[PDB]
Symmetry: C5
Amino acid sequence: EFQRKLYKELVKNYNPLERPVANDSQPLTVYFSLSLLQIMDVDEKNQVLTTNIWLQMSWTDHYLQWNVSEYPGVKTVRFPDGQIWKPDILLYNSADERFDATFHTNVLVNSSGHCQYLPPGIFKSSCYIDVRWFPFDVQHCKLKFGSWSYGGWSLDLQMQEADISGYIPNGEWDLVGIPGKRSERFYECCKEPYPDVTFTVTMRRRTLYYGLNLLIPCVLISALALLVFLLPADSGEKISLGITVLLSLTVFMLLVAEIMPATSDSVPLIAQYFASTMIIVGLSVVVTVIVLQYHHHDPDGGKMPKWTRVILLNWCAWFLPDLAKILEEVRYIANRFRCQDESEAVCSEWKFAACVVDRLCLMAFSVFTIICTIGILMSAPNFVEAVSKDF
Amino acid sequence: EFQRKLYKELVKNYNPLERPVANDSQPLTVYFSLSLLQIMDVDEKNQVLTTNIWLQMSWTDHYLQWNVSEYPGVKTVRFPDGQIWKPDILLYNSADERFDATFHTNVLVNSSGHCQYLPPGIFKSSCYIDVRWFPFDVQHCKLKFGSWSYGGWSLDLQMQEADISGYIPNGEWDLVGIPGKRSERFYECCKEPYPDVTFTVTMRRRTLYYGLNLLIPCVLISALALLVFLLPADSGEKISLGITVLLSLTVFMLLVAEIMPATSDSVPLIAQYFASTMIIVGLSVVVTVIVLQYHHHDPDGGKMPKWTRVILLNWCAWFLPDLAKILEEVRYIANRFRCQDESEAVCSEWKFAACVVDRLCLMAFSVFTIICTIGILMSAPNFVEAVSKDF
Amino acid sequence: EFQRKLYKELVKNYNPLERPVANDSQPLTVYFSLSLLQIMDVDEKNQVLTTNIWLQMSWTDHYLQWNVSEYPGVKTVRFPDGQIWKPDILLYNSADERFDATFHTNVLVNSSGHCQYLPPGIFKSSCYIDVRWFPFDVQHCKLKFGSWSYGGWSLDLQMQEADISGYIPNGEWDLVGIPGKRSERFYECCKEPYPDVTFTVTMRRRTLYYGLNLLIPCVLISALALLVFLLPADSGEKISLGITVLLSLTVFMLLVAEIMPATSDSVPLIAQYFASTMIIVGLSVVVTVIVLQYHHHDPDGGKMPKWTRVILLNWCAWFLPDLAKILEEVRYIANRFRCQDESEAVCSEWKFAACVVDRLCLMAFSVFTIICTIGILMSAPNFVEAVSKDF
Amino acid sequence: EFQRKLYKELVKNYNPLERPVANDSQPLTVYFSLSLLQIMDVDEKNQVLTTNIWLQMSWTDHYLQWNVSEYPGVKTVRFPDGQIWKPDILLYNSADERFDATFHTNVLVNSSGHCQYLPPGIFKSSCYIDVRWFPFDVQHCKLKFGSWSYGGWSLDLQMQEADISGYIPNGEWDLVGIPGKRSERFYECCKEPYPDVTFTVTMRRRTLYYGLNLLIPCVLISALALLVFLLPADSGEKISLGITVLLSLTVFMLLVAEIMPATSDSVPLIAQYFASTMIIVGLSVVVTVIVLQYHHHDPDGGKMPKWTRVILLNWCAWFLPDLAKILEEVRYIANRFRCQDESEAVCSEWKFAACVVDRLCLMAFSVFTIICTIGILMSAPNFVEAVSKDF
Amino acid sequence: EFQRKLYKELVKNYNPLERPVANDSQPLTVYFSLSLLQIMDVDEKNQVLTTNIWLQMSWTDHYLQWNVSEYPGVKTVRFPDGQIWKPDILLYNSADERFDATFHTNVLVNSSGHCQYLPPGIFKSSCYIDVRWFPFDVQHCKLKFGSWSYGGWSLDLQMQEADISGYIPNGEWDLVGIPGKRSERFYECCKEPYPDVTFTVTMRRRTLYYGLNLLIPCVLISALALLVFLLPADSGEKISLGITVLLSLTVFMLLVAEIMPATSDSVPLIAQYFASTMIIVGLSVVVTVIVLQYHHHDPDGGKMPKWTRVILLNWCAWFLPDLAKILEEVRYIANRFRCQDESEAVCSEWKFAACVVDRLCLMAFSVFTIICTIGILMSAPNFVEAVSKDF
Ligand SMILES: *[C@@H]1O[C@H](CO)[C@@H](O[C@@H]2O[C@H](CO)[C@@H](O)[C@H](O)[C@H]2NC(C)=O)[C@H](O)[C@H]1NC(C)=O
Ligand SMILES: *[C@@H]1O[C@H](CO)[C@@H](O[C@@H]2O[C@H](CO)[C@@H](O)[C@H](O)[C@H]2NC(C)=O)[C@H](O)[C@H]1NC(C)=O
Ligand SMILES: *[C@@H]1O[C@H](CO)[C@@H](O[C@@H]2O[C@H](CO)[C@@H](O)[C@H](O)[C@H]2NC(C)=O)[C@H](O)[C@H]1NC(C)=O
Ligand SMILES: [Ca+2]
Ligand SMILES: [Ca+2]
Ligand SMILES: [Ca+2]
Ligand SMILES: [Ca+2]
Ligand SMILES: [Ca+2]
């Protein structure tokens, strides 16, 4: 009975289009804050960040002042979108295709004339994502808020501390904080200045999934490709293994390339690792070809180099009537056998050379693989941190 | 003729913006309920739940009271969205990009002044999905409803029992119930408190599809990889089989990783199983390399260890003129043959050692595989339940 | 000149919110029909049906009655959405995220007061799809229409026969008919009853695509895997073939699982077929291992079982001075040769055993494959029908 | 100053809901045309066509007539959507989920009372796509326009020639023309007739991409699978090659099936080609098995057929004291050698038979492949055309 | 207090529908500019460009002129969408499905009557993308702006220089500039002319990602396929390697075809490279078949060509009582041995021929591969530029 009379009274001569103030040349103060319920999702490929937040706008209005004595028991009044005045605050860097995801909600007012506006939102923003240290990476995403048609001479934004109290953990990221900052900028459009409020979300990725799904299989594959050397040449399965491994590695590179963005600013870590692995395996294939070349060789058809063989041997050693016709034919067959034996002995020497080559290159490749893996993974700053918590 | 007159009369001096009550300081009561037609879908990857429900809001209005004697035969009247007052009840935890999926429908009123509002909706909600026990998993999804600009001093929500009578079975989940709960919370925004109504859907996954599509092939693949040992070394297909199996297993891991979320909170069961399988197969490859190492070996080039061979043998046994020239040459060839025979015998000893190694490691790996499979699958609490119904 | 005057006259004292009738307590009659232009699409995975239809609502209005003599030459008048009264008829079981796809169009009226409303629509509906007999399957999809805030005491729905005259063939389904049915239900919300109109679309899938793309390759793959037996053990390609076939079959199972829903209500046919095929091929691999076990075997190292060999043989047969030194050495070498020959003969016996095993298991597996394929495909009721038309 | 007065004057007593005419019983004439800027896209799978066009509606209005002498210098006036009357012309066969993609724009008027309305649009339409001759295919897509609530007695549509002057080439299709046609139809809804305007777009696909990406690899794969015959049986790589080729072909069939619709109306060309290729390769595998069967064969274990061998040979030929003990033992070993030689000779005969089988079946399969490829590709009507322009 | 009075005064007799000018026949001037914040994304497949920009419209209005002395301290006033007049400027070539992505914002005015309108937007445009030189490619995308219902006689567009000051680098493209141009066109719709403003964005792709992900593996694969020749025929892994490589190359072609559009206008570079690689590898397979044909060959079964062998040899050379019975049998066995030796020697000659063929074709294919790679990659104009910056 009093609420109705008050509602009649307030909009007697109102006009939403005016900035409500006692002095027309004195700027108005608006307190702007953010509240962050959830980190909905992150997309590296498209470079977008989806978040669920509540804005918080507060400002005092002169006209909507009423006395509590004449109107009893009524403390708070509400007004919808178009009936009163609201600041047209919205996101500068959006990717929503509608550009304003705010669900227009009510406005609360109390006798002094204060006014609150907490519009929720599922906001999409255009971060700049970097993968120089993927998966051991930390990301900085800035949300930039400000007014559009109102400037410093006519509006004045002041920042309050954000709110992470209701924050719900995501399960794929860790939140340090969302520090805020105010600035005044000078756009090449207009005379008067324009302020802005920037909140810088810091996130750290939890690496258990990407550590138990990518890295461990990669190291195991490298181990398997190292294990090829020991397989003796007699078994014909010496090179099918390596080629199958390379095909598997190619599949793996497809997988990882799908889940990463195409940024040419800086080369990523995981790409360095994959490149090293493929080069190592290719050199393994080449060495294996050399080995099978030495192993199969006709002693009578060819000969042997000197310097190579002697150096190889040194390195290995340090590391490790009618009766007359009868006689004639028997002599012949025995000589045949002796020649065969000598040929076989030379072949055996060839084979020993092949085995020593195998062993030497095996040790070399094991050392190279171990060193490269360790160095590449140590290169990441956050590694020491990420392994202490996630594991 | 009377309907028209009533409609004229009721909106003579109405204003939608007022909370309709006899006493302005006395709070209003609103009865809120839910009805659940269908569980539209669930998405583990994005962690979202899509449901089809009918809200149920009921409250009494003082102004829309009319006498039935003067207006005859008219019992119920209807009012659209903006003409009368409605509570702005909406979902707190939404993922719709429009944030309010409710299809604004009519409002029904009867002479006492009671009012009903049943707006339907395809609601999306941000559950927290867990896969610690996938596929034998049970999920708890909470839907949180409440008002936005109205508090306890001005509105009072009371909960009625939900409705699963019209529920349509999904074919991929089982519904236990949707218990509801009321609470009062204190947000770091405002002085007065705010209530909320939370419904906790419990779902259990039916495992026939995921049991006949994933687990059975995995066990069969492990069996095939066990069957490699028995393949004798003479056939060159001893290691191509295992490597092909590993490539297939990698493909399988791709498949499963696509259909699972990237949560680092806790390691999942199926990942434990896959890790065990890949480690087992890798050790199988290594053992096979060792076997082919022993089998192919030059007796004259090398020798044999003692402790290893004797222990191996024990374990196996418990488990299982010119005429003179003629004579000279004949003597020579016979001695050659005897030496060849001795070499062959030593080679045979090597081969027997290889076979016994094969058998021993085969039994060891069979035991390990069986034990690990059984233990990993027993680890799931719900297993005993899920196998009784689904199968 | 007369149209304008009529339009002025009709809305002189109108109000869209009243149910237009002579008697306020007498219910109104509404004739509701459907017309079906196209079956836009079907999605098994999400269980949705997308259709293009035209509603048909007809009802008489008392107020919009005018005399044709005073207003000459004007027969039909039109009214847009909010100016007159329309029944809020909409789909009960929708999946559109907007929940009302109807494109609000005009309303036609003629002097007696009759009114037509044909709003088009691309409607999405939540069918219950079943794949127990895929691809030889028939589907029943129900569209449920009714009013929301109007009941029997205040509205009365009557059904007319649907319209398939304009129906456009799809190319992937066949339409039998869309029988309609009326019912009155009692929802656990309200006192008065509520009617509903349900149209049951029946569809049959045309199988040429899925018969020439899935089944034929499957049978050919089974044939190829049968052809492995005949490959003699000497060629080392006896088991690579089968394993490659199994990998291909796994790929095929991936393909089919992608295009099918995850319903645990009932096991599907195609899954039965695939399971049978994989089990058959696995037993083939095992048999091949056994064969290569017998073929490669040292006669001197081991011996032979009796019962197995004799039974195998029976089944096959039914189915199919210095001179003294010279003499000594010659004697020795000849004895050596004789022993070698005997060993070779025993080896030949082993090999013959392997070949007979091959043949027997080949026939067994051919019989099993043929019988299972024929039985599984006959199991489908619609098969006899689907092969008469589609092929 | 005059524009304002004119705008006041015109809407003094207007009502958008009336059909504007001098005579109420005389029908109105509307000139309807289309203009086609771009062929946005085509989707075979869903059977949809996305286009960018400008409608062109023209009609004369009686009320908006003004004298140019009293109002000077003002020639054209503009009116937005709801202020004046417009015909509710829209697409009959749409797939947009909003059903009317027209961007409501202004309306232009000139003193005589003529009125223009050119609303742009990105229209989606439900073509009927056919792939009987893919990729050498020509497509007919019909766009059907007409009014909804206005008939012949009240509206009269007349068609003007379309406009392809601004047409922008797509790069994946070629446009012949868009002939238009008018018709009057009799829907089973209503008494009065209803006209319609149908434009029939004709498109021809440019085949360079699909000719250099699909066909050429297919023919090369068939060539490689032909090249298997020449590989001699001694090299164990005779059947791995063919099976790998078959796996590749399966992958290719997956690729092509993804990019084609599931229409069972008629079998497509590319499917015929793939079926022929797979059957050819399967018979190749079978022949290879036969060859390896003959090549490996124990002469003593078995014998040889007569008719087959003789016919094969003909076709090939047309196409292409103590001393006594010493003597005894020597006799024995020599007889042994002679028997071995005879066995080897019989084996050689077997091998020659295998080689001749290889050659004969090779020529047969080459002839079959060439003939089938040529015939299948000639079968397409448009082939001769498509190869003259695209290449 | 003055703002309110001014707002009352200005809209006393306003009408948004009039073009505001002193003279009704004199055209109005509008200054149009663009500002470019970000290049959101590019899609080659669908041929679309997504950008984030700010329009800039400026024009003077006669009615909204007020004196600053009477109204003190108020300099700028604001007006929302429908209250005042705005030019309906929008994109001609759009792909948004809503066709106008502009977020309608306020309008700023100052006493002289000047008016600004800066509506932001995430605009989608239909470029024409070309891949003739992918990845070393430069793209020209034109954005075409203009008015719809207003012409030269009634509106006059003038262009200001664009703004790239706030431009944010993308990380996948480089921006040269966005030159603008004005034109007057004559559409086949209307009498009066219509202007337009076209901005031509130039972009250059940064190639590090596509250079380290595609090209390097391709060259390594070609190297591996070259390395097959050196593998001696004795090892049975001579052709499995090449076929596995071809399968990998097919997978790679799938990958690249997915990420490229299906434009038949002109053949692309990367396709030329892939075609060359596959042809080279196929000829490699054929050569390998020839080699294995010569290597395995029965000397007694056949003979040798003359011209081929002699030319091959020249090119290689330039490049690089009872006792009588005893005697009889001994004679026999010795003759047997001699014949065997001669056969073996002829076989050795065959094998040497095979090896020389291997070497010659190896050098030929290495030369061909090197030349083709170098020539194909040099063919790109931008290559020399792109390698200087990106690397
Ligand atoms: C109306 O709302 C304002 C906004 O909070 C209230 O003003 C606050 O009052 C408390 C009480 O001492 C102060 O601590 C705060 O500093 C005040 N706000 C600000 C921004 O300074 C006010 O009390 C409310 N009630 C009335 C009747 O005005
Ligand atoms: C108003 O618009 C109409 C529509 O075009 C104009 O009428 C055309 O005038 C030309 C000039 O001779 C004729 O060739 C056309 O045939 C006319 N249109 C039609 C549909 O017949 C008219 O000139 C314009 N101006 C005025 C003042 O009416
Ligand atoms: C209102 O806005 C106009 C638009 O800029 C202002 O006019 C500009 O004034 C400066 C000052 O000398 C000139 O350099 C510009 O050339 C003017 N604009 C144009 C388009 O020529 C004007 O000063 C503003 N204030 C008032 C009171 O009119
Ligand atoms: Ca992510
Ligand atoms: Ca699921
Ligand atoms: Ca389907
Ligand atoms: Ca296409
Ligand atoms: Ca791109």
